[PDB]
Scaffold this active site. Structure first.
Site: not given
Ligand SMILES: Nc1ncnc2c1ncn2[C@@H]1O[C@H](COP(=O)(O)OP(=O)(O)OP(=O)(O)O)[C@@H](O)[C@H]1O
Ligand SMILES: Nc1ncnc2c1ncn2[C@@H]1O[C@H](COP(=O)(O)OP(=O)(O)OP(=O)(O)O)[C@@H](O)[C@H]1O
Ligand SMILES: Nc1ncnc2c1ncn2[C@@H]1O[C@H](COP(=O)(O)OP(=O)(O)OP(=O)(O)O)[C@@H](O)[C@H]1O
Ligand SMILES: [Mg+2]
Ligand SMILES: Nc1ncnc2c1ncn2[C@@H]1O[C@H](COP(=O)(O)OP(=O)(O)OP(=O)(O)O)[C@@H](O)[C@H]1O
Ligand SMILES: Nc1ncnc2c1ncn2[C@@H]1O[C@H](COP(=O)(O)OP(=O)(O)OP(=O)(O)O)[C@@H](O)[C@H]1O
Ligand SMILES: [Mg+2]
Ligand SMILES: [Mg+2]
Ligand SMILES: [Mg+2]
Ligand SMILES: [Mg+2]
Ligand SMILES: [Mg+2]
Lengths: 460, 458, 460
Positions: B194, B199, B426, B60, B279, B253, B251, B292
């Site tokens: 494939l 894959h 905490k 083409e 934003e 905070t 919003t 600030w």
């Molecule tokens: N070693 C392997 N590990 C993971 N996937 C594999 C492996 N060998 C084959 N496959 C999967 O098998 C697929 C092809 O299987 P097969 O040739 O039986 O398909 P088919 O339905 O007969 O295909 P078609 O209708 O186009 O002839 C591949 O797309 C690949 O994802």
């Molecule tokens: N010069 C200032 N003096 C005192 N307080 C301020 C001043 N500028 C901002 N603030 C306070 O902080 C807020 C702005 O904080 P910021 O814009 O970081 O909040 P945000 O949660 O990211 O907002 P958004 O949801 O719009 O993204 C204002 O609403 C106000 O309460």
């Molecule tokens: N070295 C540490 N000393 C004290 N407290 C700790 C320490 N490491 C982690 N923690 C506490 O444990 C929390 C994380 O624990 P963990 O990762 O097991 O939680 P989880 O519920 O599996 O979290 P996620 O939802 O991210 O998988 C932290 O937020 C903190 O309160």
């Molecule tokens: Mg903001």
């Protein structure tokens, strides 16, 4: 690939410059998507904006029909055809060679061909179409012409064109949609494909007006403060609103969002500044009665030509239509502040996707022209603070004014709180306020009350 | 089977080392999926990397069109054509030997055919296409060349190719998708089959840049500062050189204040930071930052800060991810801030957003960059929002910011909700914002149900 | 109807024995569903497992292509063809009579025909296909051959085969699916039809590996107790966990699920027992840093070859893929306990249907090989007890350990409760616990507190 600036508002941003030079752009879309409008505009702009010879190949539409239709936008195609700038060819290898003649005849750099599917009634095979459409587009590149090709679609999300072949042959594909959802119409433009260059992807809202096609693609910050119209409010806003900011007043129905909006627009006209009140709920008549009952005369402000009032129905027109009306009304009156009363009215029967883009456009344009926007929103929960959090709109706005009903000893009182003020200190107090014939009377907060946020405090 | 490295970023991991050697790979997809970009980039890489002769059979588009298009990625196929490493031959069984000659006349091992569909303008009937497609695959494996085969689709989730026969013939099938959802385009690549190797299965996000196709398939005890002293105290001596921190709250905070302080503290130790704002505009950030007691203009003057602004709904998530990679790989930051995640999640599937967050987290952690990601909660109780998010279980540290209603006033609280691999405070500590930043004061000892956002005095 | 044991893992359970003797089984499916793999395996097993003469009729794939492809699973088809066990016929009534010759030539009992739809380019009528396919399958029964017939599908839930005729002619229909949901692929096998016998109905998950096709169809109970790694926990578990039980640790993010998992795996390696930590959240690097910060050295445990750590992405691979990885990693290392950290990670972007089957397979296999499983799950509610009840997974597990944040005088404390212990007494106390550099310090319950379940107690 060098790009021809089409000068179609929004398109030069989306296409990253315009249409590739010496390359055929397909523009498919259903009936009444605005292909022809696009097709003509392309040449009109080019002719009258870079002295660019423009040839329009017709098929179903007569040159008189074409010329007459384009007088809705005030384009004198006869005048451009009289000056030898245009060249409408009334109407598949004879026309191909014919096209080149006109190109050499006027040193043509722009061509529009509407429509390129009307020519395939004699062929009912996608194959034949492909072969013929391939030859057409192939020859145009040999010439080195920049042509807008128009085809038709049956579906808004079906084949790109009628034979599902036309997009693969073309270098550039633009899809015009006129999508129907909720008995409401939304025009969108997509650049699917520009071979050998880049562009913005996905659909973008657009409108058709007396201007033609108007697509909406998607230093300042001043510490200068403007008043809200309310003195205590200014004080709780740590000196009032920033000039170039978006304020949102949210609260349940009848909390006093429009009273806030009335003072904000009153204050504008009390400093000889112009304001536009965009009403989408109550009509002009009611607004004036209620305004006047609060000790503000909008007829007087409309008399001084300081206020404009634009009330429409939030579901008469599409959201992109309302966005274009707001833009033109601003670019015209040149207001210092606008009020949108209200956003929640414009959001009903609309997807959150479309409403976000709308708000971003209004917000962005308000901020780019340094107009203080006060937008109202009626919360769909009694607890206002929950409604704020359950809205992306509330995180886009700079200032949030929360209006909240609070039940106090068998009475339905209301409180006001400057919830959020980016870039300034604000009062953190949830202050009781009353409405009288003179407007807001912001009093004191409820020191003796827990769970005020619920709207049903318990005494502490 | 032996697999030939394409050197397409991502593809060599998805295909488990590239394309079956001597074997025919079909690459189908709709118009503008980048089937042509893939087919050249296959040939281009082969020559430039492995000195592997490459024949491009076109139908083409003309050879002048290919080079002109291909020069959008800064590729000189003309230069390569002059040096007789490439070969573009313009265009039923005549071409078979015509391409067989060229292949043998170059000692060629990489072929791309764009596009085999465009050629069956005059056959249809499916049977014809099949039998003719069988010959092409059979008479290419007979030679023993490795060919990328381009074909067309009408639907993103319909037939693999136009006649629903082209995939059962082909040994390897790669489907290019450009799916439109919420008026947003998402490019994905899938290896359907494939024959004879393994894959990765399902679709994977990708983007087209000036580099071409870009598919996306130690733990030190070193601590860094948040910019906030008492926050570093509550975090048991600051963050980690690595680790993702999530600042989460309603919003306004003070997420962005925390992010300013975090980026400030980078640029005040001569280290580079990137603030990715989705934003507020650059204009507003500077005023709010300056209000600030922080000069972002100075940090950009010192060339220690880079502020990248964009609309969350402007481009796709795949797109934003590549911008963050490229902007990191260029500026080489010590830390990044993404303000905010919840903005980028707007009108996206949780599936797409999860993958995106995993990519940024893993990339930040591969290159050892401290990431502070903000998230605006959609509940007034932040602890509830935190729990109703999979992103919250991916981050290592969680900073919760909570509005709390105290004596008719809207106070704010900060709590180091979670911190892996370290002790943290905490305590749910009251804080205030001034013209100088966070003033993290004391916890509310006299209050029950402070998690609700509406305490009762105990 | 007597059934030929195919020896395809899972299939002999689903088909209630295998394929009916002297009967034609259709195996349709889309491109890359693993028909050919099934087709060959059928003969490979039969030849090398019951000395069963096997004839493979090709169409689009060359005998060399077939033979080369099957070397991914380590099958030497040349060796079997060299020994006169196999018989690949390179390639509609000539082949029919040709097929019978080979059958008599080697006393053939197994035939695979891939693919049977490639042969219908010369015919574009479902009628002609039916008549020809009827004659083919009819003659094979006259011979008395057990043949696997392969056709192709365009849709995952459309016609059984390309002409919607092939299933009605065949005695047995097996449907191979490669269904795409959430940009993720799930292979399933269905036995639609086995004329004159019984089978399991519906689709069953399966995986393709170096072994080939591996389908997952869906006395003991020992009073012997194993430790959790935590002494108070053992005491609240009324002596510790049963060896052959599934324990679930559920709680909000950062409650300490992995610390629990770390002690549980530590304790295994402190008794010279092997353990597999299947990580799906944090990677090896982080896990080791945090492990070591709790006074446990996993490098040391991995040094003693007592610990294996398998971390993958919960959305890189399909759930059936993860199930097969877990099986092979167990059948290899031969652990005494496993930890899955975590289930909620594997559940994201997955249907509850598919996730239940997954958990049942892991649970069933853990229990059938007497491996103590401790599975973690991050609750999507602040109130942990509500999350437990809103989960079918929680009712499948034998023991439930609930980890719960509780707000106490401005502090975010955490509690632990042995929620449920089938077959044993357990402590019913909701005990405060702290995490230090030495791990869990389970203290006392909150006697002075009501609504601890909410996560926001009020003082009593
Ligand atoms: N070693 C392997 N590990 C993971 N996937 C594999 C492996 N060998 C084959 N496959 C999967 O098998 C697929 C092809 O299987 P097969 O040739 O039986 O398909 P088919 O339905 O007969 O295909 P078609 O209708 O186009 O002839 C591949 O797309 C690949 O994802
Ligand atoms: N010069 C200032 N003096 C005192 N307080 C301020 C001043 N500028 C901002 N603030 C306070 O902080 C807020 C702005 O904080 P910021 O814009 O970081 O909040 P945000 O949660 O990211 O907002 P958004 O949801 O719009 O993204 C204002 O609403 C106000 O309460
Ligand atoms: N070295 C540490 N000393 C004290 N407290 C700790 C320490 N490491 C982690 N923690 C506490 O444990 C929390 C994380 O624990 P963990 O990762 O097991 O939680 P989880 O519920 O599996 O979290 P996620 O939802 O991210 O998988 C932290 O937020 C903190 O309160
Ligand atoms: Mg903001
Ligand atoms: N001045 C105007 N104001 C508003 N809408 C206008 C105006 N002029 C034209 N239109 C709109 O333009 C539409 C027609 O545009 P155009 O003729 O380009 O469509 P088309 O897609 O070429 O149509 P078809 O495919 O049926 O030939 C009308 O339906 C109308 O809504
Ligand atoms: N320099 C570039 N920067 C960014 N994106 C680019 C660039 N060049 C091309 N693209 C993207 O790649 C697309 C072109 O890809 P390509 O021509 O390979 O598509 P294709 O699938 O072959 O299309 P067709 O079916 O019409 O032949 C463009 O539409 C654009 O989205
Ligand atoms: Mg028209
Ligand atoms: Mg109102
Ligand atoms: Mg192409
Ligand atoms: Mg096959
Ligand atoms: Mg954990």
């Amino acid at each position: 690939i060098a790009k021809m600036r089409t000068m179609i508002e929004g398109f030069d941003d989306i296409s990253h410059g315009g249409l590739p030079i010496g390359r055929s752009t397909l523009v498919s879309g259903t009936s009444g998507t605005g292909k022809t409008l696009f097709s003509i505009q392309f040449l009109y702009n080019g002719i009258i904006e870079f002295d660019e010879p423009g040839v329009f190949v017709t098929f179903e539409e007569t040159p008189q029909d074409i010329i007459k239709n384009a007088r809705s936008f005030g384009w004198d195609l006869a005048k451009l055809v009289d000056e030898g700038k245009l060249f409408i060819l009334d109407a598949l290898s004879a026309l191909i060679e014919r096209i080149n003649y006109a190109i050499q005849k006027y040193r043509a750099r722009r061509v529009s061909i509407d429509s390129v599917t009307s020519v395939f009634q004699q062929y009912d095979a996608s194959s034949v179409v492909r072969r013929e459409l391939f030859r057409l587009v192939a020859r145009l590149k040999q010439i080195g012409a920049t042509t807008v090709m128009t085809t038709e679609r049956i579906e808004e999300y079906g084949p790109i064109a009628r034979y599902g072949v036309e997009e693969f042959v073309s270098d550039n594909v633009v899809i015009l949609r006129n999508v129907l959802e909720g008995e409401r119409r939304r025009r969108t433009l997509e650049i699917l494909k520009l071979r050998g260059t880049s562009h913005m992807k996905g659909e973008y809202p657009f409108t058709i007006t007396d201007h033609g096609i108007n697509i909406f693609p998607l230093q300042r910050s001043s510490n200068v403060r403007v008043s809200s119209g309310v003195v205590r409010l200014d004080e709780m806003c740590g000196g009032g609103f920033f000039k170039d900011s978006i304020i949102l007043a949210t609260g349940a129905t009848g909390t006093g969002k429009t009273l806030l909006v009335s003072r904000f627009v009153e204050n504008a006209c009390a400093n000889k500044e112009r304001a536009i009140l965009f009403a989408y709920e109550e009509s002009r008549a009611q607004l004036l009665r209620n305004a006047y009952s609060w000790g503000m005369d909008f007829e007087e402000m409309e008399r001084q030509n300081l206020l404009k009032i634009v009330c429409a129905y939030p579901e008469s027109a599409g959201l992109e239509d309302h966005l274009q009306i707001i833009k033109s009304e601003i670019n015209d009156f040149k207001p210092a502040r606008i009020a949108i009363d209200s956003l929640s009215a414009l959001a009903r029967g609309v997807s959150n996707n479309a409403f976000r883009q709308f708000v971003i456009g209004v917000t962005g344009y308000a901020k780019q022209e340094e107009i203080t926007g006060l937008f109202t929103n009626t919360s769909d929960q009694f607890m206002g603070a929950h409604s704020i959090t359950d809205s992306h709109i509330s995180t886009i706005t700079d200032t949030i004014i929360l209006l909240q009903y609070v039940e106090i000893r068998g009475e339905m009182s209301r409180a006001i709180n400057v919830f959020k003020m980016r870039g300034s200190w604000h009062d953190k107090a949830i202050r009781e306020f009353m409405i009288s014939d003179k407007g807001p009377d912001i009093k004191d907060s409820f020191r003796n009350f827990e769970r005020i946020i619920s709207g049903s405090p318990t005494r502490i």
